[PDB]
Nucleic acid binder design. Sequence first.
RNA 1: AAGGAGGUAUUCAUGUU
RNA 2: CGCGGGGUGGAGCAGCCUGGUAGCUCGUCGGGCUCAUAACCCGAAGAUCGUCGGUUCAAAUCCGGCCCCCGCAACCA
RNA 3: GCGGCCCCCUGGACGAAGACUGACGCUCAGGUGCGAAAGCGUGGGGAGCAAACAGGAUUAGAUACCCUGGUAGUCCACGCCGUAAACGAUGUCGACUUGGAGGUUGUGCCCUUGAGGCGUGGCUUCCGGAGCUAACGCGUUAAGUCGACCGCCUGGGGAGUAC
RNA 4: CGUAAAGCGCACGCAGGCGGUUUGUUAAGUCAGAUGUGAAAUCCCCGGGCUCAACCUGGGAACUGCAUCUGAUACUGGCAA
Lengths: 173, 226, 156
Amino acid sequence: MTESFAQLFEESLKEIETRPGSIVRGVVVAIDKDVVLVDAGLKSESAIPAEQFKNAQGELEIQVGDEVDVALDAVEDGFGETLLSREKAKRHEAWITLEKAYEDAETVTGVINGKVKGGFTVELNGIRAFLPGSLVDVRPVRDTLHLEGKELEFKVIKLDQKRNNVVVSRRAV
Amino acid sequence: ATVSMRDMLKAGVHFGHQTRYWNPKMKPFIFGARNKVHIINLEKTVPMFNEALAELNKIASRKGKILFVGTKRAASEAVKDAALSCDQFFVNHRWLGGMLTNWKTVRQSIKRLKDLETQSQDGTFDKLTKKEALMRTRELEKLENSLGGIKDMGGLPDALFVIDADHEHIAIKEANNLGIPVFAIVDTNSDPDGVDFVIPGNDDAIRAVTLYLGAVAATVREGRSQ
Amino acid sequence: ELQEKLIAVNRVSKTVKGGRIFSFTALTVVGDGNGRVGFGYGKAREVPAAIQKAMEKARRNMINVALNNGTLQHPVKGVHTGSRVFMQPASEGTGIIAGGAMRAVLEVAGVHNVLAKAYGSTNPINVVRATIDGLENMNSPEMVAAKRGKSVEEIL
RNA sequence: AAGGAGGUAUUCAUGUU
RNA sequence: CGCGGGGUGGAGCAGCCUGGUAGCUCGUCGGGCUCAUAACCCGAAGAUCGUCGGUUCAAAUCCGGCCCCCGCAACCA
RNA sequence: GCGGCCCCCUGGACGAAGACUGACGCUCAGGUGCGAAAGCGUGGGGAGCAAACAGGAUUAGAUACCCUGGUAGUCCACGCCGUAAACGAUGUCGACUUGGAGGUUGUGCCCUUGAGGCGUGGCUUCCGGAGCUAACGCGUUAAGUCGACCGCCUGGGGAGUAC
RNA sequence: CGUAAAGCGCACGCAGGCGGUUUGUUAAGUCAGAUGUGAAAUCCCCGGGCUCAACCUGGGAACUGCAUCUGAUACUGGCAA
Ligand SMILES: [Mg+2]
Ligand SMILES: [Mg+2]
Ligand SMILES: [Mg+2]
Ligand SMILES: [Mg+2]
Ligand SMILES: [Mg+2]
Ligand SMILES: [Mg+2]
Ligand SMILES: [Mg+2]
Ligand SMILES: [Mg+2]
Ligand SMILES: [Mg+2]
Ligand SMILES: [Mg+2]
Ligand SMILES: [Mg+2]
Ligand SMILES: [Mg+2]
Ligand SMILES: [Mg+2]
Ligand SMILES: [Mg+2]
Ligand SMILES: [Mg+2]
Ligand SMILES: [Mg+2]
Ligand SMILES: [Mg+2]
Ligand SMILES: [Mg+2]
Ligand SMILES: [Mg+2]
Ligand SMILES: [Mg+2]
Ligand SMILES: [Mg+2]
Ligand SMILES: [Mg+2]
Ligand SMILES: [Mg+2]
Ligand SMILES: [Mg+2]
Ligand SMILES: [Mg+2]
């Protein structure tokens, strides 16, 4: 039957969004020794390095037929390449987990590695946080260089993720 | 066997390149531009696809030697698979400049490949003072990689099915020079002037490539079997 | 069956570090008389090899020309790099009146009666190419009637 | 003057300085 | 010996006239084809153009010599 | 050709919406005007720079390059001169012919979802298709396809010289 | 006529050249026909006479023009809206 191309493309457009930056899940067609090929249904399949897919333990928890959610860099790189980066999705999920952990205030870690305006600053896999000048540690600690260079093991209280800021505080933990 | 329009949409044929790299000769085969990316009008694609299939069936019935040209790393394995499925010839790796026009030199290369493979396997002389054995094996492997598909073609092909006309422009030019029907799938950035049976569609997607190859393989198999 | 004739042989130089390296270029034209004509241009260190290469090239890349009783169908102009060429369908019995390279090309093509003149440059290579192009850009009464959607009697 | 990095180059909280 | 004609992959044939381009069929091999043969299709191999020369930028082609082959040539008691 | 800021006088261009006149248009030989720099006349001004000139060097020579000085001039007012690689080495006007990336200046719409999205003009830089070109290259700002008018060329020197 | 010779340094502008679109009218340009003339010789065509030819010669055609008259009104021009 003559269901027009315009009307059919309308439904297909409604199914999938082409906005850059957003995250959509794609079936992994195959894995080579250093790259993973992911089909998200766009113009073409993406070729993401396996190091990105490699887990914290240097292993490939991913597999054929697995579904994982990948952030959309662009529809085309100029060579018909649907550039997709799942580590951006990892960063977005980490910001969401950081927001949850700064709302729930549970135990968490992350290498406190820099100097904030108030004091020392923390970095934790997508969480750029602060431990202030007098609040780097509870006591009068010169361990802002422990809050700049050593992992803070605490909760987060106040965070502005859009500002790339959190409070990796000298809290109860 | 034809392909349904919903299947084409699922494959992702409608998608094209960005609206800055488009070729103005592909303007008729364009529906719209969503987010600075061209949308190919499948309303023209479906009838043209079936027309190209009919011509391919005619050639296959007349026992023509089809050549499947595809060099994109996405389409290399699929082109080889389709050509072997339909017992035809393919070029999965880089198209040698003047593969068809300089057939007299390609013929000598084929003979060299045949001699090397025959001696290595059938002749099985084994002991070749190491260094020569490694060199001969490496040369045979390279020749198999380059010309393994077309080694049994004998003469010139009667039809050239080409993936991504823009990428394989050289092969299209040689086919035009010699005189050969070309069945090329043309994205928005490609130039359809050299193609005889244009098939508007996305050459990049492996889904679309597999869809195209399956349809044409079925058609040529029907034509040959008769 | 294919009548062929050599128009011009020219000596050229390359001027390499050692000295000057000379080589020969051959311009040839072949044709079947019945209407097909094709030119060839070849180059080799020696004259016989150059002529043979030119003959092979000329044998390839032929073009058909619509001939009307051994002459042209209408006055036709032809242009190229320097060569501007005019050719006229003269009456039977006049013979081929043309200058040099045009004479050779028309004779092998099979036109027996034309009035031609070469304006501009008369460089053999360019004038041969221009003459062949002009012959190509010449339609017959059947062709014009078909393209215009009429009968030959309506066109006359 | 020599070497390294990033880009066509900057957004990169102000504060601090 | 007289005159004429001829000699082109193994065989049978074009190409000679107009000097440039070695073709067609059978046969051989391989593959496909056929269960196989056969038939059919696709490839691959095979002459240095009888030979010796001459001419020419270039000769199966033009010219000559020689070699042969064939036809015609008047002679057997 | 124009470059600090402010004021006075003044020309042109472009956009929006309309209203108006109703071919009032285009080009232009002679003619008229404007026209960098250097130069000339009269009168001022004169810091810096700087032909000429002076001296010190360099060099076989150095009537130069280099260095120390330095007058016309460079600046102002009013006249004259009327020439430049005054160049996009591309006369002016108009029409038509695939595209891309920018800049600059208007303006319409879309939720300005906040710096945005989609249009629609003017001028401007680069890349490139057909086409054209001797080639180099030009390519909607043409050197493409055409129409109107004007200027100019006819081998190199002699010579943009003589009368 | 960008680089081979050739776009005035640039503008304004008289004479001059060119003129968007519709209708009417005129018939100047334009076109058609006719008449007069465009000397003869020469040129060309068909013939004829010198034994042939050159040469001579009969008839035609031509002399692309100009003038007058009668028509046509698509375009250009004039006039009117
Ligand atoms: Mg000339
Ligand atoms: Mg003037
Ligand atoms: Mg001055
Ligand atoms: Mg003065
Ligand atoms: Mg003074
Ligand atoms: Mg000085
Ligand atoms: Mg001084
Ligand atoms: Mg001048
Ligand atoms: Mg200037
Ligand atoms: Mg000039
Ligand atoms: Mg003017
Ligand atoms: Mg360009
Ligand atoms: Mg003078
Ligand atoms: Mg002068
Ligand atoms: Mg010059
Ligand atoms: Mg010049
Ligand atoms: Mg100028
Ligand atoms: Mg008018
Ligand atoms: Mg007038
Ligand atoms: Mg009149
Ligand atoms: Mg007379
Ligand atoms: Mg007589
Ligand atoms: Mg007479
Ligand atoms: Mg009138
Ligand atoms: Mg009128």
